[model samples]
Target: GGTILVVTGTGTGVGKTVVCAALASAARQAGIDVAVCKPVQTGTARGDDDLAEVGRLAGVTQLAGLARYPQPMAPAAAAEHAGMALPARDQIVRLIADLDRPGRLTLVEGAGGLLVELAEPGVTLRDVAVDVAAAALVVVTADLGTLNHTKLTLEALAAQQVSCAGLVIGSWPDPPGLVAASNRSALARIAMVRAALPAGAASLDAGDFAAMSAAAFDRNWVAGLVG
Candidate 1:
């Protein structure tokens, strides 16, 4: 089996999809095969297609997914609104497992947060991570109230025995002061800050995105992600 990484935002609005794109772009630049799976998607009515965005941003073509709901809500709530049931835990597990292979880094993007219910019977991305033996790469922000949520997510991951890949600052505002600098320091003390990607980098062209992503992450770490 190859490396499977779960991309989880500590909470919603962490810009997790772009973080995945950056990591994917970095690994791909390092000559590692990358695949992204977003087992469940919601808000299609408003055009919330992460797979499409991932492909457009990172140039990664091996995108796989299952469920899609129209409402902009949690997977369970969206499913209920759509008058359907959530995908079973086994289905999500198998989808990720099917994409795994030698020398490939399969990235699994979580729905909303680490503990958001992704399947029936209250199955979550945490459980999917455990079932697939994947480490979690937590995405966070450097603003106030981030530390507590980051710690809670870390603790939850540890409680489930899931290894943490690292942490990534979702958006790094251009103009920063002592507050961001100190928060950056504190965050680095807790876990590796893979990158504090500049704000609005997601809208950049593919060529610039690749360049930015390449520079955003540590080269050696990206190189070591797969064989």
Candidate 2:
């Protein structure tokens, strides 16, 4: 069993891509082989720039996505707009399974947030994670009005009993007078989550990756977190 690291967020525009890429780069620096996947993406821009960039930055080569849409919208909606429904759930599962090479750490980046709908009453991003038995890394923005969003996300995860790997606080632009220092304790107190990442620490360092045990990334932390 390899470590399957799944990235989720409190909401959209919270630098999920940045955190995901950084972690992948960090893992690569630790001499671990990784396969990256973006199972579904919505947006007019074709080509997986985000995933490709992560692969390029980390020197990883695997990237996968299920179709592309012309407008920036949710995956299911974008598919509908493009006159094609989302791919069947089994296809996604197969894609992930194919990406899973022996002894390779697999990192699955969920488009949008955890509750993102792939199809109404059918498939969700969380469903994909569960299908793969992935441990989660939640990326949250350190902006105003975040406590509620963060808590709600945590509650949703709790309801699913999904294993949370850690929390990554991506910096969001807040007003000059407001600072992000105070919300750390609040997330822990209510969400029962730990802040596992340092703020705005871009570019994964070999040492940093070494310090983050595989168990910290998942229960089988060592199994696949390091590849």
Candidate 3:
């Protein structure tokens, strides 16, 4: 069986995009072909997409997204504001299922939190994970108030019977401040920290980016997850 990793965040601006890139880079270094699916994109459509940034940083070319809206909001609301139809779950399932085959790993990055609606009738990434039988990787912040959000996100995943691969710190500072340092241990108490990516990973050149991604993650764990 192939693997599909669903990447979601505790909230927006928590660096979920960066964490996604790190995972892609890590997986690629392990000799696995990678594809990313940004199920629904909100904000600018043509350029400035998260997947574009991922391509730039990870050098992963196989990428797709089901929908895009100009407004910077949740997918469902953005669809409503733009007068468009929300992406059907069946279509999304087919897209991911097609990617979920031997020798390929697909990473699906959600718009916001786990429960944020992606379509009308109350569909969320939680549904997508359940539907695809995919494991989720929660990208969380390394700061005060993170414990509560991380716990809630994990609890929600549990409630939906969705498997979580592990937790990833979206941004880990070099000399972590007092709160971030303390929160790292606290966050680990809730779930495993698969990778604590460097704070400015996006700005790195391709070679440095790949090198840092390899350094940030546990190579053995990546093999187990996607091997």
Which candidate number maximizes TM-score? 1
Overall lDDT per candidate, in order of appearance: 0.93, 0.66, 0.89
Error of 2 at 86 (Å): 0.6
Tens digits of lDDT, candidate 3, 1-227: 68898999999999999888888999999998899999788886545499998998999899887788988877887888998888888878888887776678899999989989886678899999999999899999998889999999999999999988999999999989999989999888889999898889889999999999999989889888765
Give, for candidate 1, the lowest lDDT window spanning 10 residues: 173-182
117-215: candidate 2 lDDT, tens digit per residue:
755456776787788887677888666777888777777777777777767766533332244656755665655443344444435453443343221
> How do all the candidates rank in terms of lDDT, highest first?
1, 3, 2
- Taking all chains together, each candidate's TM-score versus the true structure is 0.98, 0.79, 0.97
C-alpha lDDT of candidate 1 relative to the true structure: 0.93
Q: For candidate 1, lDDT tens digit of each residue in 1-227?
A: 89999999889888999999999999998899999999999999999999889999999999998999999999999999999899999999999999999899999999999999999788999999999999999999988888888999999999999999999998998886688888889999889999999899898999999999999999999888877
Runs in model 2 with CA error above 4 Å? Answer: 46-48, 172-178, 188-227
Model 3: CA > 4 A from native? none
Task: State how far residue 163 of model 3 sits from its true place (Å).
Answer: 1.1
Q: Residue 201 deviation, candidate 2, in Å?
A: 7.0
**Decoy 2 TM-score against native:** 0.79
